[PDB]
Design a protein around this ligand. Sequence first.
Ligand code: AU1
Ligand code: AU1
Ligand code: MG
Ligand code: MG
Lengths: 153, 591, 591
Amino acid sequence: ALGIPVMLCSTAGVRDFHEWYRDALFVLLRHLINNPSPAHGYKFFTNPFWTRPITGAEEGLFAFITLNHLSRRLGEDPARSMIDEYGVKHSRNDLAGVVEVGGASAQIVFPLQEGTVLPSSVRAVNLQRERLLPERYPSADVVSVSFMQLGMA
Amino acid sequence: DTEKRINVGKTHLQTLRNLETRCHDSLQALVVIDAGSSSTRTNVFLAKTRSCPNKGRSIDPDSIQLIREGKRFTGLRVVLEEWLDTYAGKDWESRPVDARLLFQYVPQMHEGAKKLMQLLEEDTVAILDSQLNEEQKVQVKALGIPVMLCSTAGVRDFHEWYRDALFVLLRHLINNPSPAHGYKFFTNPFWTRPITGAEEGLFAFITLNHLSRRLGEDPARSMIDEYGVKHSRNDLAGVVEVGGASAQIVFPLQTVLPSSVRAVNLQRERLLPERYPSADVVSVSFMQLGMASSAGLFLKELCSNDEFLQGGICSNPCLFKGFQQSCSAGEVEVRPDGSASVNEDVRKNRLKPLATYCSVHNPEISFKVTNEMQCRENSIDPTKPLAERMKIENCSIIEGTGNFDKCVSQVESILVAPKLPLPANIEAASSGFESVDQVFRFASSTAPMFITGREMLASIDTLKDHRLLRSDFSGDVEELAEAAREFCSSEVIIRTDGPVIQLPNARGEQKLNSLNFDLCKTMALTVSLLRHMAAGENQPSFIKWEKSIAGPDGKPLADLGWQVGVILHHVLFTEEWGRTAYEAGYSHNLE
Amino acid sequence: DTEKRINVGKTHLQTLRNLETRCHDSLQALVVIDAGSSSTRTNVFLAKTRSCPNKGRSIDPDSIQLIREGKRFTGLRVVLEEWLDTYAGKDWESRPVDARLLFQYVPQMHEGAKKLMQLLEEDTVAILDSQLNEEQKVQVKALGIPVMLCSTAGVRDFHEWYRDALFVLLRHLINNPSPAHGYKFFTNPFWTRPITGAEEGLFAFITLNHLSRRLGEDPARSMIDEYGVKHSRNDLAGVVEVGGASAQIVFPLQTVLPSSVRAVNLQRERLLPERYPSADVVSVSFMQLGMASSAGLFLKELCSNDEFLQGGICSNPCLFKGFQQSCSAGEVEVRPDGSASVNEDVRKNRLKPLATYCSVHNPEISFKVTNEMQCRENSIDPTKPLAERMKIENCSIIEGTGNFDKCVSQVESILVAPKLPLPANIEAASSGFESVDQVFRFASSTAPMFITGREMLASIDTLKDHRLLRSDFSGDVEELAEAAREFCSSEVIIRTDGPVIQLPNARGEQKLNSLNFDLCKTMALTVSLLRHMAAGENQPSFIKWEKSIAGPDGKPLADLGWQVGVILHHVLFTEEWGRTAYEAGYSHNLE
Ligand SMILES: Nc1ncnc2c1ncn2[C@@H]1O[C@H](COP(=O)(O)NP(=O)(O)O)[C@@H](O)[C@H]1O
Ligand SMILES: Nc1ncnc2c1ncn2[C@@H]1O[C@H](COP(=O)(O)NP(=O)(O)O)[C@@H](O)[C@H]1O
Ligand SMILES: [Mg+2]
Ligand SMILES: [Mg+2]
């Protein structure tokens, strides 16, 4: 009755794929998901926001969110976060970083401790500013990097 | 008779009831501090705000008009470089410097930044006081003045934590103005921040299309189809902006792009709100391609080539016959006696930012081999000291040969299509473009193009004024190439009044100055740019060279650039602008 | 050593970065102009505002504290009545008046309203200047002062278009303050408007529960169940407010009600935002039941009954033995020689608003028979002139009999449970309540009750002070009835210093004044109110008599009434308050 949102995201496999072919395949994939078999009854659906090729850094940022969510480090509630005298919400426990090595790539993701001043060349990502986490969640400046040719295969 | 007296009292109540229900318009001043490469100047704008009951307050985008562009004060690079000279020690460019130790000099960096900010505040207040009446002044002082200081190519390539640390101090200086003047200036990390080359170009595109009435959400500038999608009435025009240190190439797609080419959607990347028509725009900026930066790099590369440097004399095809200057990239001044004096000051040298970047002590060169090879291709040795880097080895005098065809082929191989990308262009390389030639080979559009830049306009105007080019000139490369070929083959004769450029076949003459002496290099840049634009799969409908765009009154309401774009980028998001500019406002800074 | 110097500079940048990210607190003044029946006074409140980056500005509800209640200036009724005396002609109450003709006197109504508004502004500024430091003054003057002028029972029953026309002029006067003082006062039709009796009571309920920490959205004052429904931690307490012209009975339902009884849901009727706990509250207000209004009506009805009026002498059971006053509802002053002087001034008479309403020339009586019969039941003849209406026919002196039981039975039949509803009570009749007795017979709740009103408190306090009632007193009617029966049977003896009330059986004594002489009428009102409260299906957990509620500091932050409630009613709707108070603000009034 509610419908099944589908999120097909390609990783390192077709990240380095030449010409238009990869992005053209994604338009076709979404159409295939949006038109499922009416026999089973399961109402599958997608959009260009859910089904799209995710970047190496994006892949790493989601791996960070997954880790901190399951380990109960990330949260908005008073059990996982705290609001100071200046209305700024801080996480009760330290946000943990991740190192994920897959088939084709390796991700190195870690949050910076109270905005560690970085050089002009180093481009860090703020979770709330880059719309990864909503305003109600505690703020964190995270360095997310992925390296091709580092995966096991 | 008595009924009319009753109607006066009824109107008295109706007029008073109107005020309670109607929207009241107030005047607000908006400040954009252009922290460019050459200088840091203030831009004072006026806009009409509309406050409606239960609807809030919002700026009318079409009411945005520039009052005046302020004095050209010290650039942010000079500010940071003096701080390094005074605290890290002189000639820090040739020595390895520990950045960790420089943290004990942050209040010292703040005191140096205070010097420039007090001058900009004094200048901003001067513009406001002289160009506003007492009624307007009350309105402006009551609403507060949002300030947007954005650094461009001047400190884009700046090393270490320094640049971003200076910005935190700059915001604090703006948020604490002089209480004497009454003008309530205020800022935040969203308004005052270093803007990327792509951002600089995107805002320049918004400015162009806004003033030319191409961009808009109203039914006069946009149309909604049967499927609820809003399309713009007229084609969105692209822009080519060549500043002091960088050149921007921006155009909307009217197109399937490769995986490597990363285009920007205005609504998805939150540049324009959802209510505005959607457009996928390619925005690219090239460092070492601005008027000052390209001048230093061209002279360095050309006067290192054995095809031009012979017996200490570098033969410059971009300079007029009879013209000669000292072999250095220093600031050229054309003296009244016909001579060209080259400034010896290391900071007033056009190679300084490139030689400071291309240093083995900069972590961007010592750790990254790709960047080291980029510097070496432009003859710059990062291992050698700063003085040796800017030095044109075995060269004393630069002699002008006036060969335009040779000048084109050189600008082509050096600036337009080089072997490796020009230094500090990782931002352009990430979007999928190593050089200017790659832009049109990978991405092309039929969208009309606009050419912006003081010297870019001067190049076309000079040829139009001397009747070499038609007044009704399109993007005809052959017409431009032949007209410039005749003009650049002119002889310089030192006359009784001063240096005069004499056109061949007794066509005409004009005075030689510190701005037009190397106009032929900019002319060659235009030719090679239009050549690559013509080479593309899709060619623009028309190419236009305009100084400013006339408004409904006839007078141009604002100048072309990123200024209006950055205002629109924040003001158009109604809910978000209302909170930061009016709900929080200058009252947020109350201690 | 050197690492600590580096850390100072690192902290310098961290502290500066905190300011850019953190929420800054500013102080704002809030003005509530109580346009009551007896007078028009200003209430100056202070509150802490919080501005957060990208989140906007909002008032902390628990930071709201009253500075001072201003001087008791001219009531809005007197203002309108003088305008009618001067433009429609004197004794307009006894003559038919054409309302259409009075429209030519709107600027004249504005000039009269300007007189009062300049005094209130002068008084408001005086409170602010004397009770704020220079730092606080800057914050207050920069944010702007929202003004909420709400008229109560004084002009609730006012005839024709006049009252609503005056309000349009009042808002214009507030929106245009003196520029000399610097305090930026501003209003709108949402803040400055005539509040209904039910609204007056609902805001009094919000005030009570806010200060007593019963109402709140935080986990300290509220709890969320497994089904996402937020419930209040402690039971929401009801209120009984007896002012100058009206009495309010407000209580939350903790209940299935008949179709005729129309209860108000706080979230559905937009009194409290969705985030606050839900409550269905019964709010009812009765005209002719306030301290001044009930005094005039009681004397009129009692001294028309042949059971009390005999040979020109009306025997008053609510007045002490030995006390005597002239037979009129005029303002009673207890002179130092023991005598009670009754004011002859027609406006300074307690029957004036009832006699002005109960006029055959008022469209509410001439067209509506139901209202005409209501007036006649209270002995008022709408056909007869104003002087004859307020006149107690065939009566010269009022003699006090001091019989409390007889005083209760009379207040009961006259004010609590009359044959027809008291005049101008269509608002109460629409909700399903003709009289005070009907309130508890149709709607009952176990919710604790609070009693508010100067004389209501004085009634219980006097008995506690003379040791007739326990210090730990609940809503025990028998305890109160016996204590008052002894106190009201006291003899008045004119002593050497002045008039003194002497308690029976040598219990004690106190000085007789213009406030306590008729305290026994208010005592009878309390008895009959608690009797009907006990008669109800559901009885309140406890009945409390409190002057003010102590805050966290120990000092009461604000007084009980509709003032804090009306502030909370607007300030708690974050998005809506931010737009009207900060986005629009005083800057909306800029001409
Ligand atoms: N008075 C003036 N009017 C118009 N243009 C003027 C001027 N003085 C210098 N200029 C020109 O502006 C340019 C300044 O560009 P910048 O904004 O400093 N360079 P970027 O950081 O954006 O790459 C220079 O190329 C210079 O030739
Ligand atoms: N100084 C004073 N302090 C406290 N209460 C005072 C006072 N002077 C008069 N009062 C009392 O306030 C009441 C004023 O009520 P109002 O608000 O004028 N009447 P309504 O329109 O709300 O029905 C009077 O009953 C009077 O006894
Ligand atoms: Mg610039
Ligand atoms: Mg009142």
